[PDB]
Amino acid sequence: NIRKSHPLMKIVNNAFIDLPAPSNISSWWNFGSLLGICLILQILTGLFLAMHYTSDTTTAFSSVTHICRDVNYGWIIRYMHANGASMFFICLYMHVGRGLYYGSYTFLETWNIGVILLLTVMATAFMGYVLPWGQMSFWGATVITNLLSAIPYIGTNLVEWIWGGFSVDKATLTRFFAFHFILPFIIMAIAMVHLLFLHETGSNNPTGISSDVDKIPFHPYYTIKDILGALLLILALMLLVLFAPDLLGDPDNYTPANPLNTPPHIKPEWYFLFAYAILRSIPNKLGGVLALAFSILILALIPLLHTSKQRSMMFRPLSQCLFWALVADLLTLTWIGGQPVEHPYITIGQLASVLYFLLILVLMPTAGTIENKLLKW
Amino acid sequence: NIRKSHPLMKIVNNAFIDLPAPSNISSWWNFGSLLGICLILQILTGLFLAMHYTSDTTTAFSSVTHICRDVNYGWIIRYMHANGASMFFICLYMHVGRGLYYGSYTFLETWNIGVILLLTVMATAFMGYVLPWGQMSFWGATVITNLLSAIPYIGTNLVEWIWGGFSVDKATLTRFFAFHFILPFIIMAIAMVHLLFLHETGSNNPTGISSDVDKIPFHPYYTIKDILGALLLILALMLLVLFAPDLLGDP
Amino acid sequence: AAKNVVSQFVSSMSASADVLAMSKIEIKLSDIPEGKNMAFKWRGKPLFV
Amino acid sequence: ATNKLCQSFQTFNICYADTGLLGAHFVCDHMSIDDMMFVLQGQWMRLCT
Amino acid sequence: PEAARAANNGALPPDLSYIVRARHGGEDYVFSLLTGYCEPPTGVSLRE
Amino acid sequence: LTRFLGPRYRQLARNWVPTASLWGAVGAVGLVWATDWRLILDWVPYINGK
Amino acid sequence: GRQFGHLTRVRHVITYSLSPFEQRAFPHYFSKGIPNVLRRTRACILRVAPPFVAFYLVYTWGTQEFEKSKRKNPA
Amino acid sequence: HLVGVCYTEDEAKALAEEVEVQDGPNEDGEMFMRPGKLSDYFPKPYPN
Amino acid sequence: ANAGDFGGYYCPCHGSHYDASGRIRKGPAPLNLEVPSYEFTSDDMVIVG
Amino acid sequence: AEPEHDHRKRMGLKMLLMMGLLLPLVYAMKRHKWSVLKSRKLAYRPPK
Amino acid sequence: VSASSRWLEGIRKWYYNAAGFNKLGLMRDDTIHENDDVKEAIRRLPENLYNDRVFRIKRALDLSMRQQILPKEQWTKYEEDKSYLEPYLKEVIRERKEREEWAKK
Numbered sequence A: 001n002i003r004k005s006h007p008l009m010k011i012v013n014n015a016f017i018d019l020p021a022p023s024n025i026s027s028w029w030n031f032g033s034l035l036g037i038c039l040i041l042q043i044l045t046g047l048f049l050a051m052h053y054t055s056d057t058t059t060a061f062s063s064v065t066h067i068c069r070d071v072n073y074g075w076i077i078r079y080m081h082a083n084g085a086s087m088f089f090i091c092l093y094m095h096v097g098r099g100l101y102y103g104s105y106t107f108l109e110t111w112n113i114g115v116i117l118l119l120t121v122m123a124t125a126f127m128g129y130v131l132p133w134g135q136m137s138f139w140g141a142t143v144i145t146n147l148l149s150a151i152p153y154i155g156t157n158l159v160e161w162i163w164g165g166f167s168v169d170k171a172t173l174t175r176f177f178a179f180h181f182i183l184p185f186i187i188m189a190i191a192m193v194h195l196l197f198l199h200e201t202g203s204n205n206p207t208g209i210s211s212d213v214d215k216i217p218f219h220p221y222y223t224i225k226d227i228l229g230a231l232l233l234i235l236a237l238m239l240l241v242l243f244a245p246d247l248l249g250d251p252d253n254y255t256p257a258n259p260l261n262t263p264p265h266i267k268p269e270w271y272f273l274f275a276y277a278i279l280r281s282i283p284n285k286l287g288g289v290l291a292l293a294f295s296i297l298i299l300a301l302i303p304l305l306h307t308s309k310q311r312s313m314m315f316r317p318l319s320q321c322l323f324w325a326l327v328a329d330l331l332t333l334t335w336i337g338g339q340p341v342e343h344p345y346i347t348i349g350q351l352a353s354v355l356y357f358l359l360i361l362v363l364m365p366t367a368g369t370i371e372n373k374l375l376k377w
Numbered sequence B: 001n002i003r004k005s006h007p008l009m010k011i012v013n014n015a016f017i018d019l020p021a022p023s024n025i026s027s028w029w030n031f032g033s034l035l036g037i038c039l040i041l042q043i044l045t046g047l048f049l050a051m052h053y054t055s056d057t058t059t060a061f062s063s064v065t066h067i068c069r070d071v072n073y074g075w076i077i078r079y080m081h082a083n084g085a086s087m088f089f090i091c092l093y094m095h096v097g098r099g100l101y102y103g104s105y106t107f108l109e110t111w112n113i114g115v116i117l118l119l120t121v122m123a124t125a126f127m128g129y130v131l132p133w134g135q136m137s138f139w140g141a142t143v144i145t146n147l148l149s150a151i152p153y154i155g156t157n158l159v160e161w162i163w164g165g166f167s168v169d170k171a172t173l174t175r176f177f178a179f180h181f182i183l184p185f186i187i188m189a190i191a192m193v194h195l196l197f198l199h200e201t202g203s204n205n206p207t208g209i210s211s212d213v214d215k216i217p218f219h220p221y222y223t224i225k226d227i228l229g230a231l232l233l234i235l236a237l238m239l240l241v242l243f244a245p246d247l248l249g250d251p
Numbered sequence C: 001a002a003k004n005v006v007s008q009f010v011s012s013m014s015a016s017a018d019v020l021a022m023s024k025i026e027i028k029l030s031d032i033p034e035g036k037n038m039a040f041k042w043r044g045k046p047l048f049v
Numbered sequence D: 001a002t003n004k005l006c007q008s009f010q011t012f013n014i015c016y017a018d019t020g021l022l023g024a025h026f027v028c029d030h031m032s033i034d035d036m037m038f039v040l041q042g043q044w045m046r047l048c049t
Numbered sequence E: 001p002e003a004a005r006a007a008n009n010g011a012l013p014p015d016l017s018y019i020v021r022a023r024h025g026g027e028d029y030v031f032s033l034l035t036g037y038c039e040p041p042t043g044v045s046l047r048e
Numbered sequence F: 001l002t003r004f005l006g007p008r009y010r011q012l013a014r015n016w017v018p019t020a021s022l023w024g025a026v027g028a029v030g031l032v033w034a035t036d037w038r039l040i041l042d043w044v045p046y047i048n049g050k
Numbered sequence G: 001g002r003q004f005g006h007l008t009r010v011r012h013v014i015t016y017s018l019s020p021f022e023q024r025a026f027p028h029y030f031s032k033g034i035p036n037v038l039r040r041t042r043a044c045i046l047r048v049a050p051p052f053v054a055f056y057l058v059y060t061w062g063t064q065e066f067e068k069s070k071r072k073n074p075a
Numbered sequence H: 001h002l003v004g005v006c007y008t009e010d011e012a013k014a015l016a017e018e019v020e021v022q023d024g025p026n027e028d029g030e031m032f033m034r035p036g037k038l039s040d041y042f043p044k045p046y047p048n
Numbered sequence I: 001a002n003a004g005d006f007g008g009y010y011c012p013c014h015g016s017h018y019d020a021s022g023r024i025r026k027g028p029a030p031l032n033l034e035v036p037s038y039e040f041t042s043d044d045m046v047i048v049g
Numbered sequence J: 001a002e003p004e005h006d007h008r009k010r011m012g013l014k015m016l017l018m019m020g021l022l023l024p025l026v027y028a029m030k031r032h033k034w035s036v037l038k039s040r041k042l043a044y045r046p047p048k
Numbered sequence K: 001v002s003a004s005s006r007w008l009e010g011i012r013k014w015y016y017n018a019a020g021f022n023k024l025g026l027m028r029d030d031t032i033h034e035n036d037d038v039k040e041a042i043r044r045l046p047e048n049l050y051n052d053r054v055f056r057i058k059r060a061l062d063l064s065m066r067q068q069i070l071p072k073e074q075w076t077k078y079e080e081d082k083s084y085l086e087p088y089l090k091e092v093i094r095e096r097k098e099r100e101e102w103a104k105k
């Protein structure tokens, strides 16, 4: 049998064909491969955009226009790439939520580099949104890069060193395009290490109980379910591309960047609004920035906060409710982030901001200790 | 011992530390790692050039000028990248000649993808030399792309489809820059499969006779010889960069 | 060597010679009455007078 | 025999009135079942074609 | 644009290639704007 | 969590203390030297210049 | 990695299975399917719905206040 | 580029101001001429 | 310009109010607005640099 | 602002029709393979 | 002994039925997260408890795949839930703590 002994097809076999997998993993386990597909789509649409895009402020806005009007089928490539990025962040957030609800974070190595995979995608989509060089691109790029000015002593030096000047200008757009090109390949490399550590143990499953007593081969059972899921992923993408391309995009980005005046109200893309809300919830520069970093780096210390003698929340009602109060709370912070710093959105943004950190750090750890005592162990 | 059981450091261990290697491989076996170094140099110098280069005919020539005059230490980055490419081809041709003289081609899988590694580097350096958009860049790009017009029946269609027009122009320079950016990462992926098939058997040696009776660990013996070789590789590069940058370049 | 290497590479990202050469600005002052703020252009960033 | 995939195997054609059981049976170590079934089916397919 | 402000009492008529996409409401906004002029309400006095 | 506080673990702490404080000298001096931190490098006599 | 034949130990467990060409891929899809969906939502609705209703009430109040907070008062 | 190689900054500044170069637009949208500064490239003798 | 509580400058991005002299009073902003090194030569004239 | 308007809707119609075909067929392939497992029956017969 | 510690059991019986692993024919000790201590305790189980534990878990993963549960007649009654693993598990922990106390002498 050559499938099991060829040094190249051996690694494919042990990952997609004869890999033992649990027999009961639900649709929430489909998002791992949809992330891979999303990445592949962003490579290909991204690559075919880079063959017609130019990286300088004078014609960066116009080269994207040139794609949507003049090159054959470039407008569809461009909206696939724009909406593909948003589908990427849908899958990312389901992927993480699956890991929290069902306790998959106990795979420390897999989980802790998963956090790294989250940061690098954010850094990618950030440096992608700058490239069309619209108004939102420019000033969104200005707010973000100035976060480093809050670091004491060395702040301004790192910002102007990143900028290559005294503000985001021609030098930034060129290097950001270079970074946006190369990072998605680094991502693919780390995603391969994601799987390598994963296969060390195999998948968790909805129950949190070892599935060694009842495994099925990945092929044909999860190859076909991953196809079906991908076909629903294409459906989601194409509905956005072909019936609502500017639903998630802001209108202000359709006016060339102006370094002299801002829009009266700026809002990130939806997938960053929850974190922008946390930033604005503090009337301090360095405080807001640190609260923004810990908002995402909180994931790295979830495994240290596991108190339950059970792994999944499937059998933990009191943790379920606190889990869904976090989704609603995160859905609240997303709403505030899309609204102007005005009454009562300000005070709401602070209460939802505490509730975020309060749930993860206090309410959920102690909630697991209670239900352990309710079960007499 | 964690070096042998951590799933990540396991693959490093079996490739650079405890890997059995012949005890008699000469300096002609140093060029495998120098190719890797050359690739790394072309990634880094290449990347830091791409942060200041613009990809359109009007200012493509001028952006390279802008690097050699205005950006701090960009002229040295640029000649490293230009001469690094030539050092890459020195190492390639020694690597192949080693394989022919000593018969290493009998590793069919390793060898046959080595051929693929040769073609993709040529395709890279080709699409790199177009980017500065000088005279040799343009007409050298014209002679090459027209080779496809010789294919019967479908020739002209493939050329004009590659061109994005009726001659090498703005549309080609943009896609060639995109191809020149992405291909060196594909190369690194195939170079990893190069090693994977290689480790299936281990290295040949000057005699053509199995060295199983007398192997030594790769570390410290060939880690240090690969360092020494790399230090002679930097010497070759820096002599070209700092004393003769336009010796291989055409005026 | 590794220092000078890394130093010359990070300095490449710092502003080039043509970015530090942006000249200064003259302003005709009779343009502006009392109680008004007019904005000008200087080093790419607004200049409030 | 070469790769030691089983202790024994036997083909059979069990006949009954208007039906029957046609196939094979084997005995092997727990890590050899897949290889035995691969080679077995491969020979059925090879004789079919 | 500097000539444009001077020819339009200091205001800049924007490029219209993308006007429907760069303002919330698209043609609903533009249609309502063009056809929506009216006398100022009591108490609002616009400069010449 | 508190496995690591007892007679033997405070002995291990006091055994490796002289070493860790030296690796802090390597890092600290290495940080000054790499970044050319002038606030420190003025009092040391010889490097003063350029 | 991990292989079949080295996972775990199991004894005295029998599994009966039918070929996929001998049975129906959609058996009682609506007959047994809908009652199972009702049981599944019934069993979890009280754990999921409240926090999202709580969000709905904050969302309408906050906009209702903001939408009129910039209205004018006679003073 | 001349500064600190073969002329002082003051010398090179005085040299740049010995020629007139185009700049603008001003607030009226017109192009106009002013003396060179250190940041100007050497004047081209022909437009094309 | 000429907006905010203090009748000077207001920043809509996150809500930082300045006064007529550019000094921060309310907001997450930590410092007053920057002033350059300038000087007045004649009456209807000014240089910034 | 959107010259591709009409063409995208024509494609959108074709995308909906193909999905209305492919989604239940691919769903049917999933259920076909999985039916071996969904109707499997287990029994535990320990020695006594 | 009293009526106050009896509604204490009533809320623990309540939490038990809400947790719902009894709906899959499972027992509390079937759901413990396997760490090194638990894997040792399972290793020490006699053949009958080990084999029973294997089948109950297998029966539940089967049900979980189909998103089904057992009839109410076959649910694990809170009164009949044998904590079969905690005796073995408590001795494993006790041994580990002894090693840890020796390790700091």
Ligand SMILES: CCCCCCCCCCCCCCCC(=O)OC[C@H](COP(=O)(O)OCCN)OC(=O)CCCCCCCCCCCCCCC
Residues within 6 Å of the ligand: A041, A044, A234, A238, J010, J011, J012, J014, J015, J018, J019, J022
């Ligand atoms: C080098 C090659 C790189 C390619 C990389 C591709 C990246 C993957 C993106 C997937 C996008 C989905 C379809 C959008 C196009 C469109 O909408 O199709 C529009 C065309 C009509 O077109 P028309 O009327 O203009 O012409 C008409 C001329 N006769 O019919 C359709 O509706 C087909 C779409 C049906 C529904 C999609 C189902 C998806 C199945 C999976 C196939 C994926 C294959 C991947 C191959 C690499």
Ligand SMILES: CCCCCCCCCCCCCCCCCC(=O)OC[C@H](COP(=O)(O)OCCN)OC(=O)CCCCCCCCCCCCC
Residues within 6 Å of the ligand: A028, A093, A094, A096, A097, A098, A100, A101, A206, A271, A274, A313, A314, A315, A327, A330, A331, A334, G040, G044, G048, K067, K068
């Ligand atoms: C940091 C990023 C912030 C960005 C803000 C994004 C806006 C949020 C918008 C909300 C969309 C919610 C999606 C719909 C979820 C429906 C779930 C449901 O129907 O069933 C509950 C299910 C219970 O099922 P059991 O697994 O317990 O057992 C089944 C027995 N038959 O239990 C499960 O299925 C739950 C599995 C996990 C769900 C994933 C959703 C969470 C998304 C964000 C999490 C980020 C946390 C850091």
Ligand code: HEM
Residues within 6 Å of the ligand: A028, A029, A030, A031, A032, A033, A035, A036, A092, A095, A096, A099, A104, A105, A107, A110, A111, A113, A114, A115, A117, A118, A121, A187, A191, A194, A198, A202, A203, A204, A205, A299
């Ligand atoms: C580009 C980014 C990513 C890719 C391509 C990716 C891909 C995958 C895949 C294919 C799986 C196995 C199949 C599955 O469970 O769906 C998986 C599992 C997992 N991932 Fe990711 N992932 C990414 C990011 C992340 C992030 C952001 C996190 C957490 C913060 C994370 C943590 C995990 C964990 C804990 C598992 C194990 C889940 C389980 O087996 O139960 N990963 N990932």
Ligand code: HEM
Residues within 6 Å of the ligand: A038, A039, A042, A043, A045, A046, A047, A049, A050, A053, A064, A078, A081, A082, A084, A085, A088, A121, A124, A125, A128, A129, A130, A131, A132, A180, A181, A184, A185, A187
């Ligand atoms: C995970 C991978 C990626 C993500 C999430 C991503 C995301 C994005 C986003 C959100 C934009 C903004 C689009 C817009 O506002 O119009 C963008 C633009 C762009 N991306 Fe990417 N991208 C990825 C990979 C790539 C790759 C690999 C390339 C090239 C090889 C690329 C090339 C481009 C180009 C040229 C643009 C500017 C054109 C445009 O704005 O449409 N992208 N990207």
Ligand code: HEM
Residues within 6 Å of the ligand: B028, B029, B030, B031, B032, B033, B035, B036, B092, B095, B096, B099, B104, B105, B107, B110, B111, B113, B114, B115, B117, B118, B121, B187, B191, B194, B198, B202, B203, B204, B205
């Ligand atoms: C980017 C391109 C390449 C890289 C990075 C690379 C790298 C390496 C390395 C590190 C080795 C093992 C150490 C050594 O023998 O020096 C090796 C061996 C080998 N390579 Fe390559 N190589 C490349 C291209 C090629 C080409 C173009 C050929 C042939 C046409 C080739 C054929 C071989 C063979 C046959 C061996 C085995 C030599 C032996 O062990 O005796 N490779 N390569």
Ligand code: HEM
Residues within 6 Å of the ligand: B038, B039, B042, B043, B045, B046, B047, B049, B050, B053, B064, B078, B081, B082, B084, B085, B088, B121, B124, B125, B128, B129, B130, B131, B132, B180, B181, B184, B185, B187
């Ligand atoms: C094996 C890898 C590579 C080889 C052999 C190579 C080779 C070359 C060559 C021969 C040139 C012509 C230089 C000149 O004539 O001035 C060039 C230019 C260029 N390369 Fe590469 N390159 C490689 C990788 C890369 C990568 C990975 C990047 C970017 C991420 C890159 C970016 C550039 C740019 C921007 C130019 C134009 C600037 C210039 O001409 O100096 N290269 N390359």
Ligand SMILES: CCCCCC(=O)OC[C@H](COP(=O)([O-])OCCN)OC(=O)CCCCC
Residues within 6 Å of the ligand: A153, A154, A157, F031, F035, F036, F037, F038, F039
């Ligand atoms: C983490 C990356 C650090 C990058 C620092 C940098 O680019 O160099 C600037 C200063 C220069 O020293 P100084 O005396 O001019 O001082 C100038 C003060 N602005 O060097 C430092 O002060 C080194 C500080 C390192 C702390 C982690």
Ligand SMILES: CSC1=N[C@@](C)(c2ccccc2)C(=O)N1Nc1ccccc1
Residues within 6 Å of the ligand: A122, A123, A125, A126, A127, A129, A130, A136, A137, A138, A139, A140, A141, A142, A143, A144, A266, A267, A268, A269, A270, A272
């Ligand atoms: C660079 S402009 C930008 N990039 C995005 C896509 C992004 C930011 C951060 C991380 C990932 C992606 C985003 O939402 N914005 N907009 C924006 C608007 C206001 C403030 C900040 C950003």
Ligand SMILES: [Cl-]
Residues within 6 Å of the ligand: A061, A064, A065, A132, A253, A254
């Ligand atoms: Cl645009």
Ligand SMILES: [Cl-]
Residues within 6 Å of the ligand: B061, B064, B065, B132
């Ligand atoms: Cl040049």
